[PDB]
Amino acid sequence: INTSILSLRYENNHLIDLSRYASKINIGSRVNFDPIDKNQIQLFNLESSKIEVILKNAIVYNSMYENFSTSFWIKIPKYFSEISLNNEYTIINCIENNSGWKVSLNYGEIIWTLQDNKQNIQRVVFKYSQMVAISDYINRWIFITITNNRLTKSKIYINGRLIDQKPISNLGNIHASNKIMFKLDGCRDPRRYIMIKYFNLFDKELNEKEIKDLYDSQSNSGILKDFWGNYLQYDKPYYMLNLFDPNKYVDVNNVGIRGYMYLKGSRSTLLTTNIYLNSGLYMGTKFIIKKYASNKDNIVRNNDRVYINVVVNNKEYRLATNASQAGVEKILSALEIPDIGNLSQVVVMKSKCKMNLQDNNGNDIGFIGFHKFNDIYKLVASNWYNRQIEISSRTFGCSWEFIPVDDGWGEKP
Ligand SMILES: CC(=O)N[C@H]1[C@H](O[C@@H]2[C@H](O)[C@@H](O)[C@@H](O[C@H]3[C@H](O)[C@@H](O)[C@@H](O)O[C@@H]3CO)O[C@@H]2CO)O[C@H](CO)[C@H](O)[C@@H]1O[C@@H]1O[C@H](CO)[C@H](O)[C@H](O[C@]2(C(=O)O)C[C@H](O)[C@@H](NC(C)=O)[C@H]([C@H](O)[C@H](O)CO)O2)[C@H]1O
């Protein structure tokens, strides 16, 4: 990263190039920086929503030989209607006089285009489906890396994994733009946006190990993430997804110590014919993470000790258990916050098993997952999980995602 030729970052209260070249950034009047993490840039389908990088003359691409790579993270809202079918739109443009490079999007596609001075084109494409129960890609932060070896191939990587490659040895002189324009160009959906972060340009072909290291290093692994890959936050309502049984959602039979929380039913079907078919995500009891031990910001960090509130009939209850009940599996209840007394409720948050319940002495009661009790999948804390994780890398019932409302998903709250 310290040897990138362009490193676009929000640092010291402004968007600048941190590279040694210090290229000029021109921003339009409708570029939105996420208050929680201002490196997350939102570009709307508006002419004033644009970032233009004016490259130093030293790094403008004009070569038959120079290898180069780009890396960035992108969050692409779900395509909601037929207006998005068959509508390729440019998002990152370094084409001038029908030569250079660009990144483009289409319904279920991320496209890399290289064009030489003879106007010959090579494209590499990542395709993802919107006909999927739970998507890895729709409206979630994904890590893009494109590498170009002028003697061999153009390669697209997604989350550090090679997806597509095409030969480019038959392309000649490439004279790209001296400007890079981040802007939605030719998108017919007026509500479309993208979110982008951590843009870099490199004057080399990155190798698989460098791409994996970049993915790991830009993941911010000390900070817990929500389903969308935004930072997990305190005092923000979350719908819960269990990764072991994703078609079930959380409910509470009754509040109080005699009640329990459990995984039930089937998720709804979100359907727009020929456009998407997904599992509904805004279902079941909402969870809210509350500060207990701690930073003064609202970000949930690895090993933070917290309370979990659950929302039942529009009122907040406390997720808790009597750790003294029979068996390693401790059934969780939703209790009245006042007069909780000495019941076990402190959760250690971990950045897939996120929630380690502790007794008031600071001993592990175990990761929160579930267990079957007479045909009922009750939520439990269980040290069985803690042990199993240390001796296998399988998915367990303690694997959760936290899903807040996000306008890029489009489901009604
Ligand atoms: C399979 C099982 O029951 N495992 C639990 C385990 O049990 C031990 C042993 O494997 C069994 O044979 C069992 O039976 C005894 C019985 O208790 C006695 O009455 C006796 O007379 O008969 C048998 C002995 O002759 O008991 C053994 C230990 O007592 O015990 C451990 C605790 O030591 C757990 O309770 C095991 O159950 C697991 O519990 C955890 C929470 O602790 C989870 O609920 C596990 O479920 C999931 C998961 O959350 O990860 C999810 C699925 O529901 C489950 N799949 C099933 C059950 O079909 C998977 C799956 O087990 C794992 O992925 C392994 O492939 O895990 C839960 O299994």
Numbering used by the authors: 874 to 1167, 1169 to 1225, 1234 to 1295
Quote the study that presented this structure, word for word.
Clostridium botulinum neurotoxin A (BoNT/A) targets the soluble N-ethylmaleimide-sensitive factor attachment protein receptor (SNARE) complex, by cleaving synaptosomal-associated protein of 25 kDa size (SNAP-25). A detailed analysis of these two structures along with a previous HC/A6 structure [HC/A6 (crystal form I)], reveals the interactions that occur across the HC/A6:GD1a interface, and the conformational flexibility of HC/A6.
Furthermore, HC/A6 forms seven hydrogen bonds with GD1a at Sia5, Gal4, and GalNAc3 through six residues that are conserved among all BoNT/A subtypes. Overall, the conformation of HC/A6 upon binding GD1a does not change dramatically except for a flipping of the Phe 1278 sidechain towards Sia5 of GD1a and an accompanying widening of loop 1269–1277. This was observed previously for HC/A2, HC/A3, and HC/A5. For the HC/A6 (crystal form II) structure there is a continuation of electron density between the Nζ of Lys 1236 and Sγ of Cys 1280 residues, whereas in the HC/A6:GD1a structure Cys 1280 forms a disulphide bridge with Cys 1236, and the structure of HC/A6 (crystal form I) shows neither (blue). For the latter, the HCC subdomain is more flexible than the HCN.
